[PDB]
Amino acid sequence: FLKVKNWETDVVLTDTLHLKSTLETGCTEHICMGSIMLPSQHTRVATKDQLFPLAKEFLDQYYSSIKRFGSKAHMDRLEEVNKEIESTSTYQLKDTELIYGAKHAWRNASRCVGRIQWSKLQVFDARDCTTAHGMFNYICNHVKYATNKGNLRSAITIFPQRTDGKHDFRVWNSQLIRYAGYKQPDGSTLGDPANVQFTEICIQQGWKAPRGRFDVLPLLLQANGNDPELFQIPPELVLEVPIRHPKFDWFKDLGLKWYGLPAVSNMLLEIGGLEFSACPFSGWYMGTEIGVRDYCDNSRYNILEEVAKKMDLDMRKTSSLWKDQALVEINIAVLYSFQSDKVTIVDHHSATESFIKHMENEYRCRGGCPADWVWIVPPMSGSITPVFHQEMLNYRLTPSFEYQPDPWNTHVWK
Amino acid sequence: FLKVKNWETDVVLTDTLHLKSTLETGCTEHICMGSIMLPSQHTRVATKDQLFPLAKEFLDQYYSSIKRFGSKAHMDRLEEVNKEIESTSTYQLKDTELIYGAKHAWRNASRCVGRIQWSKLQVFDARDCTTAHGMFNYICNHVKYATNKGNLRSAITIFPQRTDGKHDFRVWNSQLIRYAGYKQPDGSTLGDPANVQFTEICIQQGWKAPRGRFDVLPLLLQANGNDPELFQIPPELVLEVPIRHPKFDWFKDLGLKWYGLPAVSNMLLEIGGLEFSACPFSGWYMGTEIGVRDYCDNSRYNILEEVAKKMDLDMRKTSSLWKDQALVEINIAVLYSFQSDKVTIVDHHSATESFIKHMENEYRCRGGCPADWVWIVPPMSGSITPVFHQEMLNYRLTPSFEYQPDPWNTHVWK
Numbered sequence: 104f105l106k107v108k109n110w111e112t113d114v115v116l117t118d119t120l121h122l123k124s125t126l127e128t129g130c131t132e133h134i135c136m137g138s139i140m141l142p143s144q145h146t147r148v149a150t151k152d153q154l155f156p157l158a159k160e161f162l163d164q165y166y167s168s169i170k171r172f173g174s175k176a177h178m179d180r181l182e183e184v185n186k187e188i189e190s191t192s193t194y195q196l197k198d199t200e201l202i203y204g205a206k207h208a209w210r211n212a213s214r215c216v217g218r219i220q221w222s223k224l225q226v227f228d229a230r231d232c233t234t235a236h237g238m239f240n241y242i243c244n245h246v247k248y249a250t251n252k253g254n255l256r257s258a259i260t261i262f263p264q265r266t267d268g269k270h271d272f273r274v275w276n277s278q279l280i281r282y283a284g285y286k287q288p289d290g291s292t293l294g295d296p297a298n299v300q301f302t303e304i305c306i307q308q309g310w311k312a313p314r315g316r317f318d319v320l321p322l323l324l325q326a327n328g329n330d331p332e333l334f335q336i337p338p339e340l341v342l343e344v345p346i347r348h349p350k351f352d353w354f355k356d357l358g359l360k361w362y363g364l365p366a367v368s369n370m371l372l373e374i375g376g377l378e379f380s381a382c383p384f385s386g387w388y389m390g391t392e393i394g395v396r397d398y399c400d401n402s403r404y405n406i407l408e409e410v411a412k413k414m415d416l417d418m419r420k421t422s423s424l425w426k427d428q429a430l431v432e433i434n435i436a437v438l439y440s441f442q443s444d445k446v447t448i449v450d451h452h453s454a455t456e457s458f459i460k461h462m463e464n465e466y467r468c469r470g471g472c473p474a475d476w477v478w479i480v481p482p483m484s485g486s487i488t489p490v491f492h493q494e495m496l497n498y499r500l501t502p503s504f505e506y507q508p509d510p511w512n513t514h515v516w517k
Numbered sequence: 518f519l520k521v522k523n524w525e526t527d528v529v530l531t532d533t534l535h536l537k538s539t540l541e542t543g544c545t546e547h548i549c550m551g552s553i554m555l556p557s558q559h560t561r562v563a564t565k566d567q568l569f570p571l572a573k574e575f576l577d578q579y580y581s582s583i584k585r586f587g588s589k590a591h592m593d594r595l596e597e598v599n600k601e602i603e604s605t606s607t608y609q610l611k612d613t614e615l616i617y618g619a620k621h622a623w624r625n626a627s628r629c630v631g632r633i634q635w636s637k638l639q640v641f642d643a644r645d646c647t648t649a650h651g652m653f654n655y656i657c658n659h660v661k662y663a664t665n666k667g668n669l670r671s672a673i674t675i676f677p678q679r680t681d682g683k684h685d686f687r688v689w690n691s692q693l694i695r696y697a698g699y700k701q702p703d704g705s706t707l708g709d710p711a712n713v714q715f716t717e718i719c720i721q722q723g724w725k726a727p728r729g730r731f732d733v734l735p736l737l738l739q740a741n742g743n744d745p746e747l748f749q750i751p752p753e754l755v756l757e758v759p760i761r762h763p764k765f766d767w768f769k770d771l772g773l774k775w776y777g778l779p780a781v782s783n784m785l786l787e788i789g790g791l792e793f794s795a796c797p798f799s800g801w802y803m804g805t806e807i808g809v810r811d812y813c814d815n816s817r818y819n820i821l822e823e824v825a826k827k828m829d830l831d832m833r834k835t836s837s838l839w840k841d842q843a844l845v846e847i848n849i850a851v852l853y854s855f856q857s858d859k860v861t862i863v864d865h866h867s868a869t870e871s872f873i874k875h876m877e878n879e880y881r882c883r884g885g886c887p888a889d890w891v892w893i894v895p896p897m898s899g900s901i902t903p904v905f906h907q908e909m910l911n912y913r914l915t916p917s918f919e920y921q922p923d924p925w926n927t928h929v930w931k
């Protein structure tokens with residue numbers, strides 16, 4: 104029955120939810136790994152013996168959720184899934200169980216600061232898909248729906264679950280919409296340095312690169328274990344925000360833009376012991392993901408250089424904080440630009456207030472809320488936001504989103 | 518033999534030092550508490566049975582450190598301390614062992630970002646002190662020495678070790694130099710809201726408050742378990758920096774200042790199982806401790822209000838980032854002000870680069886370096902500093918600094 108404190112409001116919450124926790128963290132009584140990026144407990148073959156405990160555990164919380172725990176409908180479904188796991192050594196979720204499962208994987212994502220919206224998620228069942236073309240079609244409808252004219256809406260599309268392991272559905276893009284990255288002759292990088300290897304893989308399978316800055320990458324969709332195929336998202340579906348500043352008329356000359364829809368595509372959805380290796384999900388951007396990390400990480404676009412130049416800043420000395428000063432302007436501009444185009448965006452102050460509010464509700468009507476402080480605190484202005492001052496307990500609950508190896512290091516090619 | 522990665526330079530280090538680790542963290546295989554502020558494993562009665570293992574373990578690393586491990590001088594000292602722990606059920610450190618012990622408590626402080634200087638620490642042996650007046654004198658000499666005309670120098674003063682427990686030396690101030698805090702009639706707070714209870718305790722024992730903003734508090738020194746006594750540091754020894762900005766000539770009108778010397782006084786030094794309940798230590802300020810936390814925490818001085826006002830900022834909307842913009846100017850000003858007075862200060866960029874450099878040396882010539890990411894990353898501009906991108910392993914090594922309860926909740930009064 105552990106306690107967590109906010110050292111800004113002296114507010115205390117009591118966590119009993121962590122008792123239901125199952126998976127492991129990486130920490131021991133003698134070491135803490137709370138700052139390892141992809142621990143071996145966050146990354147993803149299962150057998151029939153292990154499946155029914157996982158399925159029972161999931162069914163028991165789903166039926167306890169619709170206020171019919173242990174009734175006839177529960178007991179028969181428990182038996183029904185038992186039977187099918189004898190027969191096929193696996194099983195299929197009901198539509199209702201897939202929606203519940205998917206929504207609580209988000210709910211349980213301890214590194215997600217936006218979880219106040221977890222119950223307002225739109226679940227697209229693509230488990231009848233058999234071809235890369237079918238996936239491309241499902242994904243396009245996802246983009247259209249979730250974008251909704253800049254009035255962004257949360258959604259997820261779920262392709263068929265892993266079976267044997269060699270008949271796996273995978274999106275090879277880490278995100279549905281990303282900008283290309285090309286190395287140069289002098290070694291420097293055009294576009295996005297993160298994607299330079301993926302941009303090469305696309306050109307290896309036959310992409311024709313418009314070798315520039317903000318070139319939207321094509322999709323690489325692998326269906327039922329087959330070699331993945333390239334498809335270009337119709338440009339009218341890729342909504343983009345040109346970045347301007349409310350003071351500096353040279354900010355337009357900087358010539359930056361960004362896509363509206365953050366849609367993570369490379370991770371694994373786990374529901375009652377079933378593994379969904381392709382489950383792209385989308386919401387809306389918190390400003391700092393673009394303005395701080397995307398734009399200003401050294402190994403990303405790295406624009407602190409030029410923004411400070413045009414501001415005419417004391418750049419000889421490290422302690423003039425010219426880096427800090429150009430970082431705040433970049434985030435004022437990303438925010439402003441999205442908002443003047445009616446495209447949904449949230450500032451790190453509003454989003455962190457909501458998560459504290461959300462934490463309140465979770466400890467009250469659920470007995471806790473797993474939270475990863477290292478990831479919740481925004482990458483700028485940490486301590487002028489309320490999450491910096493909030494103790495958080497991190498633990499792993501299922502249903503969950505998990506990391507998985509990149510397919511090009513696993514795919515038995517041809 | 519665990520591995521930690523920097524996800525900015527792709528640099529990898531290997532940690533074997535954590536195998537020598539002894540104390541516990543608070544985390545388990547099923548929960549991570551890396552964001553609990555004062556876990557029960559960081560806070561501090563010991564007996565004679567437990568003492569010799571602790572003493573042997575300390576002696577073995579001290580003698581392995583001067584390149585005479587297990588020699589005659591080691592074996593006799595091992596025996597010599599054994600004998601004295603039979604006799605007195607405790608023991609005394611040699612001057613050399615006290616210096617080594619003290620320096621490695623800093624070295625092992627995983628929440629300290631400044632540890633690159635750990636070997637350049639000046640150890641003042643005050644274990645012959647018997648009176649609160651003696652403590653006051655030792656502390657004044659500490660302040661003078663460590664301040665060194667603004668050319669600050671690291672130092673620590675070590676009063677006699679705990680014995681029975683009721684004859685304990687304690688400094689009641691959380692820091693040697695702090696500003697007073699007074700509540701108002703309307704409930705608001707003048708000075709520093711952190712110290713309002715301590716400021717009351719001083720007035721309870723008889724302080725005469727010059728009820729203003731930056732009033733340096735008196736010392737409250739408890740000697741050998743006796744009721745603590747008040748002493749005022751000679752003002753000529755308390756060096757202070759008036760805060761101005763290199764652009765805004767209304768920054769002087771803001772009327773802020775800060776003391777030069779950060780000197781933490783309320784914690785416990787543990788060396789070979791001996792407990793030093795009074796061990797004030799000092800270095801120099803990283804800028805963000807004043808400009809971000811001291812000045813801009815909601816429950817501290819909370820000046821983001823007025824700094825943004827005088828900048829004439831868009832303060833109606835949360836997403837104008839006026840808070841962020843006024844925070845960078847405040848830290849440019851604290852830095853600038855200290856530097857124009859030849860008072861030692863370090864910016865969060867320089868200090869975090871040094872710690873990565875320091876981490877390099879520690880993994881190479883020591884096999885690791887315990888580090889608390891939650892505390893190392895600075896409270897502003899997190900990800901434009903290299904520590905944000907560095908995985909760190911946190912574990913507890915001894916000698917160490919530990920938290921301890923405040924004395925006014927423990928002291929059997931009179």
Ligand code: HEM
Binds near residue numbers: 258504
């Ligand atoms: C609705 C608006 C949303 C916002 C503002 C938001 C915000 C964020 C942010 C800032 C991160 C940190 C990631 C990074 O810095 O790279 C994150 C991580 C994450 N979010 Fe959310 N997100 C939203 C929607 C969603 C949805 C719809 C899902 C799933 C259905 C989701 C699940 C996750 C997961 C799994 C992570 C990563 C955890 C990990 O790395 O293990 N989020 N989110």
Ligand code: HEM
Binds near residue numbers: 622623629634671798
């Ligand atoms: C030399 C310049 C130094 C700098 C720049 C520095 C910087 C810092 C900073 C920024 C923190 C975070 C504390 C906070 O945010 O409130 C910290 C914590 C700490 N430092 Fe250092 N420090 C220095 C010297 C020292 C010395 C001389 C000692 C001991 C001999 C020391 C031991 C510690 C300890 C024990 C902590 C707190 C760990 C905890 O909370 O458990 N530091 N330091």
Ligand SMILES: Cc1cc(N)nc(COc2cc(CCN3CCC(F)(F)CC3)cc(F)c2F)c1
Binds near residue numbers: 386
């Ligand atoms: C739906 C959604 C909304 C939003 N507003 N934002 C996001 C971004 O969510 C994720 C972001 C990442 C990034 C992984 N990480 C990037 C930085 C690095 F490359 F350095 C290391 C790997 C992984 C995930 F699983 C995520 F859900 C997602």
Ligand SMILES: Cc1cc(N)nc(COc2cc(CCN3CCC(F)(F)CC3)cc(F)c2F)c1
Binds near residue numbers: 631781800801802
């Ligand atoms: C020598 C030195 C140099 C420097 N440059 N800086 C410091 C500040 O070091 C410490 C600071 C603290 C603060 C404790 N913490 C304050 C914020 C809070 F009140 F919210 C919770 C408690 C505890 C310690 F043990 C420290 F060594 C020390």
Ligand SMILES: C[C@H](O)[C@H](O)[C@H]1CNc2nc(N)[nH]c(=O)c2N1
Binds near residue numbers: 138905906
């Ligand atoms: C080393 C560290 O774990 C790594 O840089 C993490 C820190 N916290 C983060 N937090 C978020 N939201 N996103 C990130 O990529 C990271 N990176």
Ligand SMILES: C[C@H](O)[C@H](O)[C@H]1CNc2nc(N)[nH]c(=O)c2N1
Binds near residue numbers: 554
């Ligand atoms: C809740 C959280 O543990 C707490 O606010 C911590 C976060 N990290 C910190 N880091 C430093 N350097 N100083 C602090 O006071 C804190 N506070």
Ligand SMILES: [Zn+2]
Binds near residue numbers: 131134135137550551
């Ligand atoms: Zn941990």
